[PDB]
Design a protein around this ligand. Structure first.
Ligand code: NAP
Ligand code: MG
Lengths: 758, 151, 152
């Protein structure tokens, strides 16, 4: 399992230990700032906090900061490895808190494992945190410890999964009963494996208006019903049905309606599902192996409402569904705790979303969302731009309804505006591209097949099933390099090799190249020499003929050495007379794209307009709404240089061609990126918020800005340089492109070849 | 460009920082033959003539200038060690766009700028969006420069 | 064929650059009586024992002229003109005769970059000879300078 075991063992800790880096969000680059932070000047915020404790969440963390406080006794799915020893998956849980909702997580881990001193230590560390994210407290001391801890602090004491997925689970129940046009009054339930996140879930499920006598709790030891054991089990006898001689699970169905269970191995069978009433609602939430094998049961019976917790299938129950967003409702409302109305109004938001999901800048191409409410869609997919702006305000609204909050939110229009603004700056458009490429792999030429980076990328693409690689190079050198690198790919089995020499199609290749380039300075002998010594020409001829769907070159040599071949063979797209390369950056303002960093040295107004339109179309296909800003050293007519006049001409041309495109210019970079500066300068600007597409006057400015920002102000690699305006799918990369860049660009080329590769 | 490079190096030296200059271009050490890159190479030669002790190299990319691993991969024998703290740009458009984007994206706080070099007397032209901290810092810099023969 | 003639007349000690296998089969097919080592030395463009010292010198020549170390390595395997020029510059050969393939300036750029200009000379020109009715006639700069100026 080294393709996952070793790959995950290769953990991103190498630059600086720990995914979290406690760092100043404020400037600390001047003695004034340092004195404001540790010298007289920092005594004032502390004194103001001491005067009235109302200022605790304001001047410090503890506003956005949760602490996933743990004794390391059930580390996600690991168990009792320890507080300090739990740090890997501790940080793994804490990193999908900031990543998806911007939750600060102090990964402080309580070393006290006793079920009564652990609470003492946690309550001791209460003032550090504005809401604890109690996780890895194991069963049965999870319920005991959480019950003890809820009653002490005056700040949101919200456990993990124990409170947890009940919101997602009960939302899924509310939607599933909607699917089969049933009612909560008469629904019957079957629960198996009363574990940490299982036995506490029906308690919420009851809160919807559910009678206790309809729930049948079970564990490893048969069925937990009143009459089975002389000593009635706590928190389970309320639901416990009268004794009726039902000792086996295969008969206790009697036409039930729900299978809410968060446990381990399988307990349900196909005949068990058959004994269920009409329209079964199996909800097997087991992560290792689904308790019903959904394909088998669906072949046994149709119209299934099977719900799981794995992302391979729709209706996935992750923590990111509401946990970061619960605290985005819990901490951002000022609550002193989380009630059951908190836990139930957020049920009415994510359940509402599944049958009220639409628009939200669907990826015009790529992605392949194809999400409609029904038997295969009960709750939204794990990651959603409004999984926040619907669930977090639900929790806050429940906070004010419960009257337990200390900082009630004002008019929700402003709250929704800020939440959506935060939404724009965090997008993961590459995951839909990977998903869409995986369901229809195409043949991609990699002309630099002997490169170590290209070989690693080939291994990754074979593993993820994104493409059918076609390497170009000497098979001997490729094989020895593969063996030395340690890869598990083989010729023919995983990737096709095209030998640059002794190619059986040599005659038909150089002939086509000559017929393309006979009147462009290439003789027949030069064509023959190019189809043996220029792998880019071989790949381009392969793609043009039809033996491959896309090409990914550029990892060797200069950009234009490959782009000239690409343009000569494929040509320009229909209705397009220019090409441009778009580079993506993850700035603090969000995903930003810089247009024509590589192709045109000094584009003119018409070329700039074409590049702007192509960049907007490409960014639209990513699922991001294009917000273009033409950049210059002049701010809205400040200078009369030919460059600024060219930018204004391009703006007019773009407005002519695409009246619906949000674009403005020419302006400065800060005016484009921050809205306050632009509003001060141009209050009537057609550009709203931060611009995500930056069109530059010349290639020098674009390249210098991108190179400086990538090493200074950038998080990770997504795509770039995305070549636009060529007839066939091909992306010329750079010699310093990483393996991740190559894999992402190959996936993008595969998805573009799924859309008429011409 | 050579005069600007020398004045910038002198000013950064007066700040107490060792000047490490890198002339920036879209070409990485002769990759392109545009007049801009040739001008950058000419400026590099002129600077090396005028100030043999100044640590400077170019023309290169921004990432090659800022991170040493990229430069060592490209030019193992580069006269520039570590990260460059002075970035000389081919034209005002590239310089202004890069500074404006980096200031709002990748920047902590305000220290100084735009520091005017080459005028007889101490004077600094600021921008209409300059903050109070920027004005105070620039006034202090002008005061200190006037303590050093304001002519 | 020219190598056969030069071996026969004893005018030069040829140093061919190419794949020894292809060279030998082409020799056998053509009907020539030359053999590797016996009459002419072969330098294999791939698996050359002096590969490391060759691309290193090419890089040191062209590091600030747009050529990276990997591009230098790729040129000393796929560009025979670069191999021959580096050979001549090092001293392992005395002269080069290229240009029978490709464009004139593709080879002249390599030649100028490696060898440079002569001392006291800032330009290059190609002279072509003709046997006219008036005698031997030479036409100056038919290949190098597109639009020379007065000094050139
Ligand atoms: N959101 C998610 O996807 C998510 C979140 C959390 C957990 N989970 C899944 O839930 C399970 C454990 O999570 P947890 O920490 O909440 O619970 P846990 O504390 O690990 O307890 C699991 C329970 O399952 C029961 N069990 C074990 N083997 C069984 C068998 N052969 N037959 C019947 N019952 C059996 C045990 O009950 P006895 O003590 O009576 O044996 C045990 O208490 C794992 O499968 C995990 O992947 C999924
Ligand atoms: Mg956990």
């Amino acid at each position: 399992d080294d393709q996952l075991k070793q790959s995950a063992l290769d953990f991103h800790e190498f630059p600086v230990p720990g995914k979290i880096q406690v760092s100043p969000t404020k400037p600390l680059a001047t003695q004034r700032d340092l004195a404001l932070a540790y010298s007289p000047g920092v005594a004032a915020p502390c004194l103001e906090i001491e005067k009235d404790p109302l200022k605790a969440y304001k001047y410090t963390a503890r506003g956005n900061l949760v602490a996933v406080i743990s004794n390391g006794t059930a580390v996600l799915g690991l168990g009792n490895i320890g507080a300090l020893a739990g740090k890997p998956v501790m940080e793994g849980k804490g990193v999908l808190f900031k990543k998806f909702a911007g939750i600060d997580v102090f990964d402080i881990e309580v070393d006290e494992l006793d079920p009564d001193k652990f609470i003492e230590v946690v309550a001791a560390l209460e003032p550090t945190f504005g809401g604890i994210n109690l996780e890895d407290i194991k069963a049965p001391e999870c319920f005991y410890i959480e019950q003890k801890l809820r009653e002490r602090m005056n700040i949101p004491v919200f456990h993990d999964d124990q409170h947890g997925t009940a919101i997602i689970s009960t939302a899924a129940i509310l939607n599933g009963l909607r699917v089969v046009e049933k009612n909560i009054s008469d629904v019957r339930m079957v629960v198996s494996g009363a574990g940490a996140a299982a036995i506490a879930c029906m308690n919420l499920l009851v809160a919807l208006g559910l009678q206790k006598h309809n729930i049948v709790v079970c564990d490893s030891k048969g069925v937990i019903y009143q009459g089975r054991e002389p000593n009635m089990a706590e928190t389970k006898a309320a639901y416990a049905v009268v004794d009726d001689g039902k000792r086996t699970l295969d008969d206790v169905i009697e036409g039930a309606d729900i299978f809410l269970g968060c446990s381990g191995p399988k307990v349900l069978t196909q005949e068990m599902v058959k004994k269920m009433a009409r329209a079964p609602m199996i909800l097997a939430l087991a992560n290792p192996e689904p308790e019903i094998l959904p394909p088998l049961a669906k072949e046994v019976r149709p119209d299934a409402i099977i719900c799981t917790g794995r992302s391979d299938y729709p209706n996935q129950v992750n923590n990111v569904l509401c946990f970061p967003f619960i605290f985005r409702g819990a901490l951002d409302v000022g609550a002193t705790a989380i009630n059951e109305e908190m836990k139930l109004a957020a049920v009415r938001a994510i359940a509402e979303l599944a049958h009220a999901e639409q628009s939200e800048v669907v990826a015009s191409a790529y992605g392949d969302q194809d999400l409609s409410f029904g038997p295969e869609y009960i709750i939204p997919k794990p990651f959603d731009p409004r999984l926040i702006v619907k669930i977090a305000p639900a929790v806050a609204k429940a906070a004010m309804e419960s009257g337990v909050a200390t900082r009630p939110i004002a008019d929700f229009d402003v709250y929704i505006d800020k939440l959506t603004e935060f939404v724009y700056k965090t997008n993961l458009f590459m995951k839909p591209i990977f998903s869409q490429a995986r369901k229809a792999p195409k043949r991609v030429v990699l002309p630099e097949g002997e490169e170590a980076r290209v070989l690693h990328a080939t291994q990754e693409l074979v593993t993820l099933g994104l493409a059918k690689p076609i390497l170009i190079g000497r098979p001997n050198v490729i094989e020895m390099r593969i063996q030395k690198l340690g890869l598990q790919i083989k010729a023919g089995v995983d990737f096709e090799i095209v030998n640059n020499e002794s190619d059986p199609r040599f005659k038909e290749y150089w002939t086509e190249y000559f017929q393309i380039m006979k009147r462009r300075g290439v003789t027949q002998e030069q064509a023959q020499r190019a189809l043996i010594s220029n792998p880019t020409v071989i790949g381009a001829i392969m793609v043009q003929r039809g033996e491959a769907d896309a090409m990914i070159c550029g990892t060797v040599g200069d950009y234009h050495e490959h782009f000239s071949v690409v343009k000569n063979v494929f040509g320009y797209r229909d209705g397009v007379h220019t090409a441009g390369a778009m580079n993506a950056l993850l700035l603090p303002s969000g995903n930003t794209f810089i247009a024509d960093t590589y192709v045109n040295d000094e584009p003119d107004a018409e070329e700039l307009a074409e590049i702007t339109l192509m960049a907007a179309e490409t960014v639209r296909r990513f699922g991001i709404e294009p917000r273009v800003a033409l950049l210059s050293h002049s701010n809205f007519g400040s200078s009369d240089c030919p460059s600024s006049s060219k930018m204004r001409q391009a703006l007019e041309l773009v407005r002519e061609r695409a009246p619906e495109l949000m674009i403005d210019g020419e302006m400065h970079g800060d005016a484009a990126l921050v809205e306050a500066i632009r509003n001060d300068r141009m209050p009537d600007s057609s550009l709203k918020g931060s611009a995500n597409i930056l069109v530059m006057p010349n290639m020098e400015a674009a390249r210098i800005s991108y190179n400086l920002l990538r090493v200074s102000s950038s998080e990770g690699v997504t795509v770039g340089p995305v070549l636009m305006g060529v007839a066939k799918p091909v992306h010329v990369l750079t010699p310093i492109a990483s393996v991740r860049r190559i894999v992402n660009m190959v996936a993008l080329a595969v998805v573009e070849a799924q859309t008429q590769p011409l």
